[PDB]
């Protein structure tokens, strides 16, 4: 005999609750850098 | 010197200039290396009238100087000569999905059934060579070498029996074909050195290697082994064994011989392998333009 | 406005672009407590985004280079050594062209009489007794800033134009007229030619003899150039195919091609060198952007 | 050969290419099915 | 363009001091990408968790080399090199750098215990060895020889010939290659490489013999005669039993040639080794070297 096993994946919407002021974010002023390539110049904004 | 202005000799139309505005960021080769060129020197049409031989077009496309289209303004047309190791965006023409990170070579246009809907202007077209991955570039060069090696075998209708099986190839769910390979004497020269290098692999192969097949068949068993046994049994025209030997302390000679074998394989690979012109980093979601940071 | 006006605007923008690449504005607040020399140096503040060539300082015994110290602009060869004290030893192009086999007997003897001493004789014996050539000696670059000290300092260019300092009197590669040849359909086709170096072996019945060829071609692609060079060397190639199996020396090829750099067609002129009165015809390329690729071997 | 015959799995290539070492190395070997109606499926197997 | 890598987990002071010891190194990176986690850093996502040997070798050819520049508070700054410019590399590998050498990247020791440079939560940091090109070719050939003679049994001088193959010497720095047969920690398994080489050497002489009859354009320069001599020195006894007695198909010949040209572009990885770096000068005491970047 045999035990056929199978998994199935479902599209689920799934709500969250959180108590207020539960976690704090210490963050940077966004830093700016520029890469001056020959045909484009790419500005990259980073933020920690 | 980097910038090259092309100004068309024949006049054009608004549909033509609309196609040129769509046609931006395409790699186009020029032979001239001047600052001002005309419509006679732009593209590959000034050479694709001489026999349309695929080997010949690939050779002269290697001799060409590649540029990138920029800023179609009026009748004038800017071409940037790309510098080495820099980043550029390329609009693509080859029928492929263009997975990122790979290398790209630059191949002659495979003439499809539909006429080119790009530019046909007073007995002059814009013959743009295609940009392909290096793997299918090597695959096409293999198919040319194989059709040469079969044109060696002179027959009637067996040539057709080989071509209709061989020529339609599929890579990344795309069907292409390359007919009209009249098998001129220029590819015969490249066939010569392939025959030489296989002859040297034959003569310089050590005792360990052919023995390694048989010992691995006696030891283990696998699918790879199963079809290797199929090939080794299906051909047996020579298969000579230099038998009486003991795997004796001749190991420096063994190293020398395996270095030679690797070097002849490097030679056949240098035949069958084309120069990579681009290295992809970032592809748009359309797979219509993609970026590279390379130049030979 | 005036045409000469926008031309002056473009020239001034080139000058200020050079100034932006050379100097850096300093956002250190720079209070008054400095000496005026340190003041003006913090006003200028040079950095080395100006030369754009890559050079290397070099120590080599002065016995080996005879012709080279006097004549600037020459290929150099790294010869590694199993001696611990000096692990690398640097070799003149003409010093190795002595026992290149292409060179005729008159030019060779002339070269030898420039190269007659005990150290240079012993190093020729080392190069002869080594099995192959191409990976005990190796290409290094182009000569500038001879010292001619006790143990001589040589600068050497890896990439870029051949100049020491102040971007002035840019030297050129000096390649011997006998050792260069240009296989083309049309020589000096349209414009700038790439200069390549080809090492070619030969077996005259006893040992191996290398040959140093220099080719100038419009073809950039190494596949194209080895395809034209096999056509040039087909006969010798077949001889050496018969040799190499019967040989046991650890080599695996007939030759190798390697790129030296860009040149210009109008900048190729002949001439001659002289060292102790030995008149010697050379082909002096003038302005060279030195560039190297990996050695591509061919069998 | 007869086990491949009866379990009904195709031989990979009549004309051996380097797609074969992509196959045995690990790649999408089966052409994904031309028709599909309900998304993904896979069923593993224990003998009992 | 720079790259920031953030570490997933906590680091020790020993870890941060290790990074300050290793503030210049090459790192291969899969994605040409700007922010990278520690899970994708290094070569361990590929080595020992994915494909082995040639696949690893091919991948190391196709990855992005990117050097360490500076270590932030928990981050790594990695600058990726442009072709033709100077950079600086610290010397991790054993073999001493000298001026004007060409440099390349080889896969490391298989599974060796140098604290794996860093253990951190079932993750190790694996870098390729920067090594001169002549050494890299020699190591490639020795690994092929070990991988060939590993399969033979009933050999009496196998152990001494393994020791002779694994002991190499280059500018007075010896090393033993980890692949001595019958340990089997990790070999990188070399099987597809040795099988493809031996399919080349075994399929070659029939193909070349078959076309030899039709060789040249009926007026030849050393293409029928010298090449026959090459074929005869290997097979002086040629075509005795013949197996099938010369009843061949054009489609069979097609499939033979098509496989033998397949195997070359598959062994394209062990074909070449590119010069990643040309070192121009070397620091005192051989701690680091300033090189230029190519390819």
CA neighbours within 13 Å on the CB side: how many for D22? 15
Chain E interface, best mutation among A30, A37, A41, A48, by max E CB count within 10 A? A48
Cα B128 to Cα B45: distance, rounded to the nearest angstrom? 8
Distance CA B158, CA E70 (A): 66
| Residue E254 contacts D, CB cutoff 8 Å | yes
Q: C283 in contact with B at a CB cutoff of 8 Å?
A: no
- Say yes or no for a CB contact (<8 Å) between B251 and E152: no
In terms of Cα–Cα distance, which of E265, E279, B22 is closest to D17? Answer: E265
Cβ E226 vs Cβ C244: under 8 Å: no
Shortest distance, CA B84 to any CA of chain A (angstroms): 11
CA dihedral B19, B24, B29, B34 (to 10 degrees): 100
CA D17 to chain A, closest CA, distance in angstroms equals 35
Instruction: Please give the Cα distance from B231 to B225 (Å, whole number).
Output: 10
For residues B105 and B276, the answer to whether their CB atoms sit within 8 Å is: yes
Q: Is E154 left (phi over 0), alpha (psi -120 to 50) or beta?
A: left
The span from the first CA to the last CA of chain E, in angstroms, equals 17
CA pair distance C146, C149, nearest whole angstrom: 9
What does this entry list as its resolution, in Å? Answer: 9.0
CA E171 – CA C87 distance, rounded (Å): 9
Q: Inter-chain contact B255–C231, Cβ cutoff 8 Å?
A: no
Q: Are C274 and C239 in contact (CB under 8 A)?
A: no
E80 contacts in A (CB within 8 Å)? none
State whether residue A38 sits within 8 Å of chain B by CB.
Answer: yes
User: How many Å apart are CA C82 and CA B163, to the nearest integer?
Assistant: 57
Interchain CB contact of A10 with D (< 8 Å): no
Classify B64 in phi/psi space as left (phi over 0), alpha (psi -120 to 50) or beta.
Answer: beta
End-to-end CA distance of chain D: 27
Tell me the C-alpha distance between C6 and C2, whole Å: 7
A35 touches chain E (CB under 8 A): yes
Using what technique was this structure determined? cryo-EM
Under a CB-based contact definition with an 8 Å cutoff, are residues B94 and B291 in contact? no
Quote the CA–CA distance of C4 and B206 in Å, as a whole number.
Answer: 75
Torsion of CA B64, E275, E260, E228, to 10 degrees: 90
User: Nearest 5°: phi and psi at C196?
Assistant: -120, 160
Report CA-CA distances (Å) from B296 to B114, B194, B251.
33, 26, 40
Q: 10 Å Cβ neighbour count for E146? A: 20
Instruction: Provide the β-strand partners of residue E2.
Output: E79
As separate numbers, helices (DSSP H) first and strands (DSSP E) second, chain C gives: 7, 13
Nearest CA in chain D to E253: D15
Q: Is B119 within 8 Å of E181 (Cβ atoms)?
A: no
Using the beta-carbon criterion (under 8 Å), do E1 and A46 form an inter-chain contact?
no
What span, in angstroms and rounded, lies between the C-alpha atoms of C275 and C70?
8
Report d(CA D14, CA C242) in Å as an integer: 38
Closest approach of D24 to chain B, Cα-based (Å)? 8
B293-296 LR contacts (CB < 8 Å, sep 24+): B293/B85, B293/B86, B293/B87, B293/B88, B294/B84, B294/B85, B294/E83, B295/B82, B295/B83, B295/B84, B295/B85, B295/B86, B296/B84, B296/C220, B296/C221
Q: Which residue among E1, E4, E35 places its CB closest to the CB of A35? A: E1
Task: Mutate one of E86, E98, E99 to test the C interface: name it (highest C CB count within 10 A).
Answer: E99
What would the two tokens of residue B143 be?
């198919």
Rounded Cα gap, residues E215 and E227, in angstroms: 10
**Residue numbers in B near C226 (CB within 8 A):** 270
Contact C177, C283 (CB under 8 A): yes
Nearest to B80 by CA among B45, B61, B90, C17: B90
> H/E element holding C285?
strand C278-285
CB of C90 closer than 8 Å to CB of C68: no
Residue C128 CB contacts under 8 Å (≥ 6 apart), including other chains: C99, C207
Phi and psi, residue C296, nearest 5°: -105, 115
| Tokens describing residue B215 | 């010992």
| Cβ pair A38:B86 closer than 8 A | yes
Closest CA to E28 of E80, E2, E64, E61: E64
Q: Does chain E reach chain C with at least 3 CB pairs under 8 Å?
A: yes
Catalogue the E-assigned strands of chain D.
Answer: 46-47
The beta strand positions in E7-53, using DSSP E, are 26-29, 35-37
B93 to chain D, closest Cα gap in Å:
24
Q: By the CB < 8 Å criterion, does B202 face chain E?
A: yes
CB contact (8 A) between residue A38 and residue B89:
no
* DSSP H or E stretch at residue B79: strand B76-80
Nearest to B143 by CA among C270, E258, C176, E140: E258
Spatial distance between the Cα atoms of B105 and B277, rounded to a whole number of angstroms: 5
Closest CA to C294 of C201, C222, C227, C193: C222
Q: Please check whether residue C161 is in contact with residue C169, taking contact to mean a CB–CB distance below 8 angstroms.
A: no
Distances (CA, A) of E100 to E92, E129, E278: 18, 18, 6
The whole-angstrom separation of Cα B240 and Cα E239 is: 8
What DSSP state is assigned to residue B21?
H
Distance of CA B289 to the CA centre of its chain: 21
User: What's the CA gap between C47 and C24, in Å, rounded?
Assistant: 8
Restricting to E residues 32-71, those with a Cβ less than 8 Å away from any Cβ of B are 32, 62
Residue E86 to residue E99: CA distance in whole angstroms: 14
Q: Are C74 and C177 contacting, i.e. CB atoms less than 8 angstroms apart?
A: no
Task: Give the helix ranges, DSSP H, for chain C.
Answer: 3-22, 36-44, 93-97, 105-114, 118-129, 222-232, 234-246
Cβ contact C–D (≥3 pairs, < 8 Å)? no
- Cite the beta strand spans of C87-171 per DSSP E: 88-92, 137-146, 151-159
Residue B259: Cβ within 10 Å count: 19
CA nearest to C290, candidates C257, C268, C258, C265: C258
| Rounded Cα–Cα distance for residues B63 and B31 (Å) | 8
Q: CB of B175 within 8 Å of any CB in chain D? A: no
Given the DSSP bridges, would you call strands B88-91 and B103-107 parallel, antiparallel or unpaired? unpaired
What number of other Cβ atoms are within 10 A of residue C27's Cβ?
6
Contacts of C80 in chain E (CB under 8 A): 98, 171
- CA end-to-end span of chain A, whole Å? 57
Helix and strand tally (H, E) in chain D?
Answer: 2, 1
Distance CA B165, CA B110 (A): 18
For residues C198 and C258, give the distance between their C-alpha atoms in angstroms, rounded to a whole number: 7
Tell me the C-alpha distance between B89 and E282, whole Å.
Answer: 37
């Amino acid at each position: 005999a045999a035990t056929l096993v199978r998994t199935d994946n479902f599209d689920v919407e799934c709500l969250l609750y959180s108590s207020r002021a539960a976690t704090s974010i210490i963050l940077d002023d966004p830093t700016v850098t520029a890469e001056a390539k020959d045909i484009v110049t790419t500005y990259n904004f980073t933020q920690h | 010197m980097e910038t090259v202005y092309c100004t068309f000799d024949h006049k054009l139309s608004l549909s033509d200039i609309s196609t040129l505005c769509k046609l931006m960021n395409i790699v186009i080769p020029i032979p001239a290396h001047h600052h001002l060129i005309g419509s006679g020197n732009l593209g590959l049409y000034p050479i694709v009238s001489s026999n349309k031989d695929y080997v010949h077009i690939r050779n002269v496309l290697r001799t060409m100087v590649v540029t990138i289209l920029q800023k179609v303004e009026g009748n004038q047309l800017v071409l940037r000569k790309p510098m080495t190791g820099q980043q550029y965006a390329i609009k693509n023409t080859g029928p492929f999905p263009w997975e990122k990170g790979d290398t790209l070579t630059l191949i002659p246009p495979l003439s499809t059934h539909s006429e080119e809907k790009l530019l046909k202007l007073g007995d002059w077209e814009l013959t743009v060579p295609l940009v392909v991955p290096t793997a299918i570039a090597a695959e096409i060069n293999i198919r040319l070498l194989c059709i040469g090696l079969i044109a060696v075998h002179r027959e009637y209708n067996e040539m057709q029996t080989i071509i209709d099986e061989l020529c339609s190839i599929q890579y990344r769910d795309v069907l292409i074909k390359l007919p009209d390979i009249v098998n001129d004497k220029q590819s015969m020269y490249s066939m010569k050195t392939a025959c030489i290098s296989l002859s040297m692999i034959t003569a310089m192969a050590p005792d360990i290697v052919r023995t390694y097949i048989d010992r691995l068949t006696l030891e283990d068993h696998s699918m790879l082994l199963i079809k290797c046994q199929e090939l080794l049994s299906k051909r047996t025209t020579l298969s000579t064994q230099r038998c009486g030997q003991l795997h004796a302390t001749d190991i420096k000679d063994e190293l020398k011989k395996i270095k030679s074998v690797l070097t002849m394989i490097d030679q056949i690979n240098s035949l069958t392998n084309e120069k990579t012109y681009f290295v992809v980093c970032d592809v748009s979601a359309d797979n219509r333009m993609a970026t590279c940071i390379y130049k030979n | 406005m005036n045409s000469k006006s926008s031309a002056r605007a473009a020239i001034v923008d080139t000058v200020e672009a050079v100034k932006k690449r050379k100097y850096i504005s300093i956002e250190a607040g720079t209070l008054n407590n400095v000496v005026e020399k340190e003041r003006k140096f913090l006003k200028q503040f040079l950095s080395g985004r100006e030369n754009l060539r890559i050079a290397a300082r070099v120590f080599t015994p002065c016995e080996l280079l005879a012709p080279e110290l006097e004549n600037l602009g020459m290929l150099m060869y790294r010869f590694e050594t199993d001696v611990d004290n000096p692990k690398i030893l640097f070799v003149g192009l003409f010093f190795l062209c002595s026992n290149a086999f292409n060179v005729s007997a008159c030019v060779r003897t002339a070269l030898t009489t420039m190269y007659t001493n005990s150290m240079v004789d012993n190093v020729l014996s080392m190069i002869n007794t080594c099995k192959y050539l191409e990976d005990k000696v190796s290409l290094f670059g182009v000569t500038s800033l001879v010292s001619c000290g006790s143990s001589c300092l040589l600068s050497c260019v890896m990439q870029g134009n051949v100049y020491d300092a102040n971007k002035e009197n840019i030297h050129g590669l000096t390649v011997l007229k006998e050792i260069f040849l240009e296989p083309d359909w049309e020589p000096r086709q349209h414009s700038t030619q790439y200069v390549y170096v080809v090492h070619v072996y030969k077996e005259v019945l006893s040992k191996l003899q290398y040959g140093i060829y220099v080719v100038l071609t419009s073809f950039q692609n190494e596949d194209l150039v080895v395809d034209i060079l096999r056509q040039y060397f087909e006969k010798e190639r077949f001889l050496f195919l018969n040799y190499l199996i019967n040989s046991n020396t650890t080599l695996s090829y007939f030759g190798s091609v390697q790129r030296i750099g860009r040149c210009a067609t109008e900048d190729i002129k002949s001439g001659f060198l002289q060292y102790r009165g030995i008149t010697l015809p050379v082909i002096k390329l003038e302005n060279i952007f030195v560039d190297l690729s990996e050695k591509k071997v061919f069998v | 050969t007869w086990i491949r015959h009866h379990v009904g799995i195709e031989k990979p290539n009549p004309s051996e290419g380097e797609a074969l070492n992509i196959i045995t190395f690990g790649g999408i070997n089966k052409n994904p099915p031309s028709i599909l109606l309900h998304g993904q499926q896979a069923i593993c197997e224990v003998i009992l």
